[PDB]
Design a protein around this ligand. Structure first.
Ligand SMILES: [Cu+2]
Ligand SMILES: [Cu+2]
Ligand SMILES: [Cu+2]
Ligand SMILES: [Cu+2]
Ligand SMILES: [Cu+2]
Ligand SMILES: [Cu+2]
Ligand SMILES: [K+]
Ligand SMILES: [K+]
Ligand SMILES: [K+]
Ligand SMILES: [K+]
Ligand SMILES: [K+]
Ligand SMILES: [K+]
Lengths: 250, 249
């Protein structure tokens, strides 16, 4: 499909991240409004999630159990909200400096890009101490994604590249993306396709698994894309920072 | 023709400033430090600032005193030129501040970006005052001219807003085609310079004029800050290229 639609979100001020669950519900972090809103599939009235004390929400992720994870830029913390609960929980991350992205794998492990510390940290389910991923040369990590094989994908803002790291591997590889200008967000589907928002180019590129030729998705009117998500049906959701809107493309 | 300044080891720089002596100050944001370069020099010096957390803004007054926006620590640090005396300005309730500026009277203006407001502190004062701006949306840059008029980049509204001294009625500068602007600077002749960050260009608007001009910059990649000296020379931080570019004007 080459025709995008604008999700009926209202009152958006600088959308920063986007996530989608199994039921099609789209979660969006509202940077300028210090809130996280969600919109059910087909619905037109968004609801505000019962988060408390948010300061510049930068990234969002949702697991299979409906738990919503949010990186709090202004508070240097990561909070989570279980399904049906109205009491958030601050994950026991430490030493965070401007958390920019969040991802959760099949085992419940939470991955967080540490913008100010040039590192990616992860926290196993129920663990109290974090571990640092063996990435090297990261310049301002901005986004993170993890596929079904445990491979972690990270957008290198300051290096205009996307690096990946297989599970249990200490050798990182640079994805064959071309012409990248300030990558901001990253997402990967169950088929291995990597989707990356190009902040400096106002475009969204994708790269199939094992491919060396990227493809620019036919999004229109993009102004500073900040986040990207992909659902079960392959629809790509993109937060339009400059336009205060969220678009989707089938 | 433009000139690249011999700065070394820059990592995602944000702010830029220049004093009367032509010394250029830049905020090395990715290195949590502020370095300066004297006019005609190629050896930079690191300012004695300490504990900076993701700093963004930088300004310099007549006496050479340097002000930096400690963005990650929600404060503004002052460094006197005479002694090594450092002082955290008594600002209150700051939330992710971005811009900083200072006028001839020593009043420091800081863009409280997270609160969509601009607050000022008089020289030697402990009580801050919120400027009567209305409808600011994620503002980034702030500047002040000789007459005390405060200029702010309404980054979320893609516009530049000014407010005269004593004025409580703001006016929108007739800029066109702005896309997520970041920095603002003001010269002696009342010319406002704005970094069109989303367009990789630097635009300017003379006093009273309603149409703008684009500065002949080349190879700009996501610019952040802008500064102007006495001779009209424009300095811009090529943030995406980790460099500071000078254009004689
Ligand atoms: Cu950058
Ligand atoms: Cu940074
Ligand atoms: Cu910040
Ligand atoms: Cu903001
Ligand atoms: Cu913006
Ligand atoms: Cu940008
Ligand atoms: K954003
Ligand atoms: K953000
Ligand atoms: K961020
Ligand atoms: K970021
Ligand atoms: K980014
Ligand atoms: K962005």
């Amino acid at each position: 499909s080459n025709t995008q639609t604008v999700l009926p979100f209202t009152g958006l001020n600088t959308p920063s991240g986007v996530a989608v669950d199994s039921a099609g519900t789209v979660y969006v972090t509202d940077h300028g409004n210090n809130r996280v809103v969600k919109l059910a599939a087909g619905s037109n009235t968004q609801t505000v999630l019962p988060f408390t004390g948010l300061n510049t929400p930068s990234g969002v992720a949702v697991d299979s159990a409906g738990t919503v994870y949010v990186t709090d830029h202004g508070n240097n913390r990561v909070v989570k909200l279980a399904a049906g609960s109205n009491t958030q929980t601050v994950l026991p991350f430490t030493g965070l400096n401007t958390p920019s992205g969040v991802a959760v794998d099949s085992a419940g492990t939470v991955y967080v890009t540490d913008h100010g510390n040039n590192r990616v940290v992860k926290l196993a389910a129920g663990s109290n101490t974090q571990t640092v991923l063996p990435f090297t040369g990261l310049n301002t990590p901005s986004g993170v994604a993890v596929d079904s094989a445990g491979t972690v994908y990270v957008t290198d803002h300051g290096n205009n590249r996307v690096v990946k790291l297989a599970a249990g591997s200490n050798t990182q590889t640079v994805l064959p993306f071309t012409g990248l200008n300030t990558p901001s967000g990253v997402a990967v589907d169950s088929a291995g396709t990597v989707y990356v928002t190009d902040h400096g180019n106002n475009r969204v590129v994708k790269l199939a698994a094992g491919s060396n030729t990227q493809t620019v998705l036919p999004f229109t009117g993009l102004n500073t894309p900040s986040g990207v998500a992909v659902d079960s049906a392959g629809t790509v959701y993109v937060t339009d920072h400059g336009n205060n809107r969220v678009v989707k493309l089938a």
